[PDB]
Structure formats: C-alpha cells, structure tokens
C-alpha cells in the first residue's frame, strides 16, 4: 500500500517562519497514524473535534499540513479560542477544527551559540485575520496619523522583528516546531484512509 509522505513533513531540514507558514496537501495514499502516537519526542498531541482513538478508523478525502517555529510560551496560543501575538496576528485557527496539533522541542537543531536571527513574525496588524489567512506583505503600520509614507520615523514602526533564539534561556524561550494537521471531508471519494 502506497504510504503518505509523513516523513518529509516532520523530518524537514528547514522550517519556515510563523508569518510565512507553509501549506502542503496530501492525497491518494494510505495514512499511517501508528508512527505518530507511538513516539515520545513530541510534547503536545491534542486533537480537536476528532478523537485519536478512532483516528485509524475515521478517514476522509483531504489532509492539510502546516509547519512553523514558535517558542514555549505561545504553544497554548495555537489552540482555538484564546488570543495572543501568535493568535490575533500571524497564524489563526477556526473554532470548528476537526484536526490535530503537533509540537516538539528542537533547541540544538534550530539555534546556535551566536543567536538565531532568521525567524520573523508580525508584531502588529490593522486588525485580526480570518480563520485561515497568510500575511506576507511587509507594509508599514498605520497609526492614528501616518505621515511617514516610506520612512521609519515616529509613529511608523517595522512590522517584522527578529526572533531571539539563544541556547541558554529557559524552557519557554526555547524554539518549538509546531505542525498542524487539518482534516476535512468533501463530496468526493476518499483518497487517504486507514490501513486494514
């Protein structure tokens, strides 16, 4: 049975930023959840809407996967419902999710002694986003008055700030790769399904 490429989703050498999270779909294979819950490297395996007990029995047509890097104090912010700098900005999750959330700690792989500066995030936006949007534009923020029109002076700040990753801080400041799995079914024949 053709097996879905769950390896390259999790065992990826490079991970994108939270504000530029990737989206990869998978179809027409056989899903293997038995390699997911039989491991212990992850720190959060919570599934909203679909219980993990019947994960190997309940099976749908399309599966969506995301991947981005955050730290330890906003892992609860990824969950649907609560607010924060990773919730009202960058990523955003709907309230009717039928998927799962993956989280593990990778400190040595995602950081070195000199301090990582390759990760960015949206500090501030005009407003919140839809349950599923991507924000790539780096336009300057609009204060109550916006006379900068191209400069970075007063009342006009850069929305992107570098992300501090140093190996000797606390648990909540360490990098935390997060993978979000999305499950939904349409009016189409099932493509990926559990082994029999």
């Amino acid at each position, epitope marked *: 049975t053709n097996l879905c490429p769950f390896g390259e989703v999790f065992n990826a050498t490079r991970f994108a930023s939270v504000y530029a999270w990737n989206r990869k779909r998978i179809s027409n294979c056989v899903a293997d959840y038995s390699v997911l819950y039989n491991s*212990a490297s992850f720190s959060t395996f919570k599934c909203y809407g679909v219980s*993990p007990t019947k994960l190997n029995d309940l099976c749908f047509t399309n599966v969506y996967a995301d991947s981005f890097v955050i730290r330890g104090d906003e892992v609860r912010q990824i969950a649907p419902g*609560q607010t924060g700098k990773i919730a009202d900005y960058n990523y955003k999750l709907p309230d009717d999710f039928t998927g799962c959330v993956i989280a593990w700690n990778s400190n040595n792989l995602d950081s070195k002694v000199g301090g990582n500066y390759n990760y960015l995030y949206r500090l501030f936006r005009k407003s919140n986003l839809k349950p599923f949007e991507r924000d790539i534009s780096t336009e300057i923020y609009q204060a109550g008055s916006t006379p900068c029109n191209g400069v970075e002076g007063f009342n006009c700040y850069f929305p992107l700030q570098s992300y501090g990753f140093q190996p000797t801080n606390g648990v909540g400041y360490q990098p935390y790769r997060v993978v979000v799995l999305s499950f939904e079914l349409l009016h189409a024949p099932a493509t990926v399904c559990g082994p029999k």
Partner: antibody, heavy 120, light 109 residues
Framework: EVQLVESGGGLVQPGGSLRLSCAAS????????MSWVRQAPGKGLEWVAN????????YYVDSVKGRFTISRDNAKNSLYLQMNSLRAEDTAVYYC?????????????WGQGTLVTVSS | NFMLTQPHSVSESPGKTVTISCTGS????????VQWYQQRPGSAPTTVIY?????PSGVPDRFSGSIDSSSNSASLTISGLKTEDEADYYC?????????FGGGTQLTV
C-alpha cells in the same frame, strides 16, 4: 477479556536484586505501550517507568533512574522489570499498566499487583 | 516540576452532586489530556473517564467532566452518587517524557 497476573517477590531484600514479571494474555502484546505505576501505603499514586512497544524507548524520573531497568519480550507475551540497590522508601505495591494509545491518553487496563517490602 | 494540586476529602455530601477540581502549577493543563482514575483501596483500580470527555464502555453516564482554561483546572462531576462511588480519584496529566499524578480525593459518604 484480559489477564494481567504477575509473580513479584514480596520477600524482604535490603539493597539486593529482585526481578518482577507481569504476564499478559488476551491481546496482541507487540501493539501497545507498557508502563509501571507505584502507590505507597496510605499515600497517592505515582509514576515509575514506561517502555515503548518495541523496547526502543524507556523513561524514568530523577529518583528511580540509574537503579531500575525494564525490558519487554513480545515473543512470550510478557514483560520483565529488574531493580538493584533498594532503599527505604521502596516499600510499596507495584502495578503493571498498559497504554490505550501510547504515552498520551494513558492507562486502560489495570493489573492485580504484588506488594514488595524492603526492611532490615 | 509539573505538580498537580488537588484537595483532600473535599466531597462530604451524602447526596446532591459532586465536584472535584485538580489544577496545575508549571504550565497549562489544557495542552495535554487530563484524566481521572477510580481506585478502590484493597482492590484493583479501573478507568472511570479517559481523554478530555470520553466515557469508556461499562462506565455509567452519571460520571462527567469539564475543562476550564480560566483557572487552569479540570473538573469531575458525579450525578447519581450511590454507595458504589466510594473511591479516591487521581488526576493524571502528560508531560514531556514524564507522567504526573494527583494527590487524590477520598470520597466519603
């Protein structure tokens, strides 16, 4: 139905070597996680160790690690636990436990348990 | 240091409903699944409620639970409160390559 009987040693053994075996039957052994939980007399529950379904992974806590080893054998549908250098706080009853889905959801079937007493 | 705080002997009601709350200290308990185990001293325990809110087969529908993220605590509710419900329940939560356990609540009637 499930049968989880064990043959642990309740004999007094101050700082020696004793092995516990928790037999399993009624289900496929090499498909689910295994774990060990311990309760002191008159106190609450506590966790000791857990082991992957293939024996590749094993975890303990700070106090129990370094003196407790655990390895399962899926061919004979049984598991073994061996400890050395016992101390005073090890007077408790040891229960062998099985996992419903892995390390996340937790225990689903509970064993009978043998009482282990260490003194001088 | 994910210690779980649970009161002792907080259920002293012969009738009405029962409420038991167990909270966490180091981090949010809503990130991982938290369950309760019904234990009969002098006998083997059994699972009364698993996952967040999932009742196992054979467990009566009187037992129910809830998750509140405001106080970072998990609740357990018993409806019938018969004589069989005498037990001590321990809240168990998942940690990174570790397992924690609650103090327990001795239910007297």
């Amino acid at each position: 139905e499930v049968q989880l009987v064990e043959s642990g040693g309740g004999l007094v053994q101050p700082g020696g070597s004793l092995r516990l075996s928790c037999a399993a039957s009624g289900f496929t052994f090499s498909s689910y996680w295994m774990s060990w939980v311990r309760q002191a007399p008159g106190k609450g529950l506590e966790w000791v160790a857990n082991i992957k379904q293939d024996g590749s992974e094993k975890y303990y806590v700070d106090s129990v690690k370094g003196r407790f080893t655990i390895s399962r054998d899926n061919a004979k549908n049984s598991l073994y636990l061996q400890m050395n250098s016992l101390r005073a706080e090890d007077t408790a009853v040891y229960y062998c436990a099985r996992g419903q889905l892995g390390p996340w959801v937790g225990v689903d079937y509970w064993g009978q348990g043998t009482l282990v007493t260490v003194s001088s | 240091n994910f210690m779980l705080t649970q009161p002792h002997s907080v259920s002293e009601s012969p009738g009405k409903t029962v409420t038991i709350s167990c909270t966490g200290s180091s981090g949010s308990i809503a990130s991982n699944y938290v369950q309760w185990y019904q234990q009969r001293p002098g006998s083997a325990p059994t699972t009364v409620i698993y996952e967040d809110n999932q009742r196992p087969s054979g467990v009566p529908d009187r037992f129910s639970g809830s998750i509140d993220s405001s106080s970072n605590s998990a609740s357990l509710t018993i409806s019938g409160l018969k004589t069989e419900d005498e037990a001590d329940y321990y809240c168990q939560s998942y940690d990174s390559s570790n397992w924690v356990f609650g103090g327990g609540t001795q239910l007297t009637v």
